[PDB]
Structure formats: structure tokens, C-alpha cells
Amino acid sequence: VYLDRKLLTLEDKELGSGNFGTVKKGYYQMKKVVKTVAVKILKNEANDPALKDELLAEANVMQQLDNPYIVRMIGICEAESWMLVMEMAELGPLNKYLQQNRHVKDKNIIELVHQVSMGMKYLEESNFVHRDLAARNVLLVTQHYAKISDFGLSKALRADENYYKAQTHGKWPVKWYAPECINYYKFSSKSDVWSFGVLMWEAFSYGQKPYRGMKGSEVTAMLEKGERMGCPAGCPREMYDLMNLCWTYDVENRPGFAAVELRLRNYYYDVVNEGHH
Numbered sequence: 001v002y003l004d005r006k007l008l009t010l011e012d013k014e015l016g017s018g019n020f021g022t023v024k025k026g027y028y029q030m031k032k033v034v035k036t037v038a039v040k041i042l043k044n045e046a047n048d049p050a051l052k053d054e055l056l057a058e059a060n061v062m063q064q065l066d067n068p069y070i071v072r073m074i075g076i077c078e079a080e081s082w083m084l085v086m087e088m089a090e091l092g093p094l095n096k097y098l099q100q101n102r103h104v105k106d107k108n109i110i111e112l113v114h115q116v117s118m119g120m121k122y123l124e125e126s127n128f129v130h131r132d133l134a135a136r137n138v139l140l141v142t143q144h145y146a147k148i149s150d151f152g153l154s155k156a157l158r159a160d161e162n163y164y165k166a167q168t169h170g171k172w173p174v175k176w177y178a179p180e181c182i183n184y185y186k187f188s189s190k191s192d193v194w195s196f197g198v199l200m201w202e203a204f205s206y207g208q209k210p211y212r213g214m215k216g217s218e219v220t221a222m223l224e225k226g227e228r229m230g231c232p233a234g235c236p237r238e239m240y241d242l243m244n245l246c247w248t249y250d251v252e253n254r255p256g257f258a259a260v261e262l263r264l265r266n267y268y269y270d271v272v273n274e275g276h277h
């Protein structure tokens with residue numbers, strides 16, 4: 001899990017940023033080949049060991065995860081600051097990508113979000129909760145290969161319960177969070193299913209923000225009235241129905257990722273069939 005700093009080559013060039021630190025590109029000298037990597041580098045802290053073991057927990061989460069639609073952790077490295085080293089998804093976050101490519105085809109969008117449901121189905125089976133599932137946190141390896149990343153808020157569930165109970169917190173991505181998260185601070189796979197719904201909407205809206213121009217409270221207000229974001233331009237009705245099904249207020253009646261993955265899998269093949277015609 002710990003890596004040799006003298007096998008890692010960083011590039012002065014920065015790729016991204018978040019109030020944990022920054023994202024840069026680099027290379028790790030593997031056994032025979034050199035492998036390209038993305039590295040999370042910490043705001044060299046205080047000494048406020050908050051970020052420090054968020055990174056540690058995040059990395060311990062990721063080393064348990066083995067799946068083609070989850071980003072892979074290469075390892076950690078302590079130097080100037082703390083570094084989390086991951087396999088690189090070159091095309092970057094899904095939302096920025098679709099914002100810069102308004103003419104990706106609908107079928108290609110279905111392909112990518114179904115790939116995300118396969119990763120989440122696996123995550124569900126593994127009794128991990130992601131708690132930050134958004135389009136900014138889906139990364140493109142190619143225009144036809146998506147992976148889930150950014151496991152900073154993630155939790156492994158206890159063997160005796162089906163949800164995780166937040167106690168405190170910093171900012172929450174409220175617009176992606178299910179009502180039971182905001183109301184009872186309970187996070188489960190079903191509430192990841194709710195976020196996946198918002199993720200679908202972002203995707204079919206080519207990277208536009210959900211609940212445009214509203215604050216958390218206006219969002220909570222809308223949803224309690226039973227209101228929901230409408231159908232994005234050009235989004236198939238079957239995919240919009242699945243969105244609304246993900247936004248089932250009542251957790252018990254909201255589907256899990258097995259049902260959601262199967263629904264997407266079938267519809268993608270129906271579309272692949274029609275296209276051949």
C-alpha cells in the first residue's frame with residue numbers, strides 16, 4: 001500500500017483541485033513498464049489531522065475494491081505532503097467532458113451511465129456506501145469507458161446494519177442527497193440510488209447542474225411537494241422514468257442497484273438492436 005517516492009515522477013502541471021488539495025499527473029515506475037497515474041496531494045495541514053486520516057480511510061476503502069468500473073488505488077506515499085496515487089482516467093470528470101462535447105450521442109450516454117450502475121451494483125453487493133455519487137466523480141478512461149472515483153465520504157457498513165449514521169459533518173452535496181440523508185442522516189445503498197438518479201439527469205443534460213439556481217432549502221421545499229426535475233432535452237422516456245424511480249421518496253420502495261442495473265442493461269441492448277437497423 002505504501003509506495004517508493006523515488007519511483008514516482010510528478011509533473012509541474014496541475015489537472016484539478018478540491019479543498020483537500022490538488023490533482024496532478026505523474027508516472028510510477030512499475031515492475032517493467034512505467035504507469036501513468038493521478039495523484040491526490042494534500043493541503044499540507046496545520047497540524048490539523050483531519051484531512052490526514054480522511055485520506056487514510058479513503059485509501060483503505062479503495063484497496064478493498066476490485067472492479068472494472070471503480071478507479072483503482074495504486075497506493076499511498078508520504079513525503080512533502082500526503083499523496084494518494086491512483087490509476088489515471090485521462091479524459092477526466094464526466095460532467096466537464098459532456099459540457100465540452102455537446103454532441104456525444106444519446107446511446108453513448110446510456111452506455112456510460114449503465115457502466116456506472118454496474119460499478120454501483122458491485123459496490124452495493126460489497127456493502128460499501130459511496131455518499132458522493134455525482135457526475136464530477138465519474139471519470140472517463142475513454143469516451144466509452146467510465147469509472148467511479150472520489151471515495152472520500154465513503155463508508156464500509158457494519159455487518160449488523162444496512163445504513164451508516166452520520167454524526168457531524170462539513171458541507172454536504174445536498175442536491176445529490178436523498179431525503180432520509182437530510183432528515184435522519186442515514187446513508188445506505190438506496191440513497192446512493194437516489195444520487196445515481198441525479199447523476200443520470202446531469203449526464204443526459206450534458207453536464208449541467210441540477211436544481212439550477214436553488215439553495216438547499218428551496219430544493220428540500222420542492223421535493224417535499226413531490227416535485228422532481230423534468231425530462232432533459234432528447235432524453236428517452238424510458239431513462240426519465242428510471243430517474244424518477246430513483247427519486248422514490250420512501251426508501252423501502254426505492255429500488256436497489258441490481259434492479260437499476262438490469263433496467264439499464266436491457267434498455268441499452270434494445271437501443272443497440274434498433275441502431276443496427
Ligand SMILES: Cc1ccc(Nc2cc(N[C@@H]3CCCC[C@@H]3N)nnc2C(N)=O)nc1C
Pocket residue numbers: 015016017018023038071086087088089090091092093136137138139149150
Ligand atoms: C482534467 C482531469 C483529468 C483526469 C482527472 N482524474 C482524477 C480526478 C480526481 N478527482 C477530481 C477532484 C476535483 C473535481 C474533479 C475530480 N472528481 N480523482 N481521480 C482521478 C483519476 N484517478 O484519474 N481529473 C481531471 C480534473
